[PDB]
Curated annotation (Swiss-Prot):
Signal peptide: none
GO cellular component: extracellular region
Residues of the full protein shown: 1 to 38 of 46
Compartmental location: Secreted
Descriptive protein name: Iota-conotoxin RXIA
Species name: Conus radiatus (Rayed cone)
Note: Negative results: does not have effect on sodium channels Nav1.1/SCN1A, Nav1.3/SCN3A, Nav1.4/SCN4A, Nav1.5/SCN5A and on potassium channels Kv7.2/KCNQ2, Kv7.3/KCNQ3, Kv1.2/KCNA2, Kv1.3/KCNA3, Kv1.4/KCNA4, Kv1.5/KCNA5 and Kv1.6/KCNA6.
Length: 38
């Protein structure tokens, strides 16, 4: 449903531990444009 799987705003290193994208050491949504996600 409208929810994540692991957690958001939590700092991590591998994007895998998050359905969205763990960018700059954080589990967040697709906050990017030219930079690739995961």
């Amino acid at each position: 449903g409208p929810s994540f799987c692991k957690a958001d705003e939590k700092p991590c290193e591998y994007h895998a531990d998050c359905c969205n994208c763990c960018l700059s050491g954080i589990c967040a949504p697709s906050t990017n444009w030219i930079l690739p996600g995961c």
